[PDB]
């Protein structure tokens, strides 16, 4: 799975045990797994188990979750996006 | 997409325009697309467009569709399976 | 498909004919198929059909299923996890 600082999960609206897609900007690999919470303030992004074959320390990734909803709701939906820089600093 | 003899679609409960997975037994490639109907009795399995990079004439494939349902229904669900031999002859 | 000892399916809440993901720790391959029951007690994890191109005997894998539910329920959801030691001996 991928262990993710709980602050980051909150900012992106991603839940513990939720399915996530990881898109690796560095090497182009794309895979799906689930999220687990890391300690708040740790700034951890840990790719564990089999997924360690698809990402390495230092790689830049996008981690996304998807939900379903009816069409009218979808047409006004605004995703929760957290942007990062530096030492996995969340941009405000 | 994958064009499939309508008799085969009926036997497997697969609908025109339904999402399908194709698992290629010959070369191990796995991909997802959607089904379109070919003429009844044609026995066609045509892999079209981009999917032609993942299968060739003569390859043996499994074509599957998935549905969602609540747990109690899922525990008594029986999939619609059509078995083939020879000249895409559906085994009765 | 992947045939799996019914005892293992029971522990993980995975159903016969349910969609499953298989993530191969040994070779990094990741694929999706559906589950079938192998005999109970047998310890069998058998990768059948086209899937045999993605795993070999002795490979270590993770087998997972996913369900949907509303956000309100998902917030407290607890998955069913089975852990293994030695030769598919469930702990």
């Amino acid at each position: 799975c991928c262990a993710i600082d709980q602050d980051f999960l909150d900012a992106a609206g991603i839940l513990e045990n939720e399915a996530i897609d990881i898109w690796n900007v560095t090497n182009g690999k794309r895979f799906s797994t689930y999220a687990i919470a890391a300690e708040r303030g740790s700034r951890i992004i840990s790719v564990n188990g089999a997924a360690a074959h698809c990402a390495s320390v230092g790689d830049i990734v996008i981690i996304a979750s998807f939900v379903t909803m009816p069409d009218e709701e979808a047409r006004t939906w605004r995703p929760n996006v957290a942007y990062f820089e530096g030492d996995n600093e969340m941009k405000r | 997409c994958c064009a499939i003899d309508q008799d085969f679609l009926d036997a497997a409960g697969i609908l025109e325009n339904e999402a399908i997975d194709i698992w290629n037994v010959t070369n191990g490639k796995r991909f997802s697309t959607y089904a379109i109907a070919a003429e009844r009795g044609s026995r066609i399995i045509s892999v079209n467009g981009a999917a032609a990079h993942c299968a060739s004439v003569g390859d043996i494939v499994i074509i599957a569709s998935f549905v969602t349902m609540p747990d109690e229904e899922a525990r008594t669900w029986r999939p619609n399976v059509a078995y083939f031999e020879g000249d895409n002859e559906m085994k009765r | 498909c992947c045939a799996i000892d019914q005892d293992f399916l029971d522990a993980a809440g995975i159903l016969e004919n349910e969609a499953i993901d298989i993530w191969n720790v040994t070779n990094g391959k990741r694929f999706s198929t559906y589950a079938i029951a192998a005999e109970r007690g047998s310890r069998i994890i058998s990768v059948n059909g086209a899937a045999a191109h993605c795993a070999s005997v002795g490979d270590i894998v993770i087998i997972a299923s996913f369900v949907t539910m509303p956000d309100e329920e998902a917030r407290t959801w607890r998955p069913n996890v089975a852990y293994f030691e030695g030769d598919n001996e469930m702990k």
């Binding site: 689930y34 | 037994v25 | 522990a11 058998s46 005997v57």
Partner: peptide
């Protein structure tokens, strides 16, 4: 809104058999 959640998993099992031949 509907979430997709891990239902369950078998963690680190070993593949005991692998045959291209399956009819079922």
């Amino acid at each position: 809104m509907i979430r997709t959640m891990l239902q369950g998993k078998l963690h680190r099992v070993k593949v005991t058999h692998a045959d291209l031949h399956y009819e079922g």
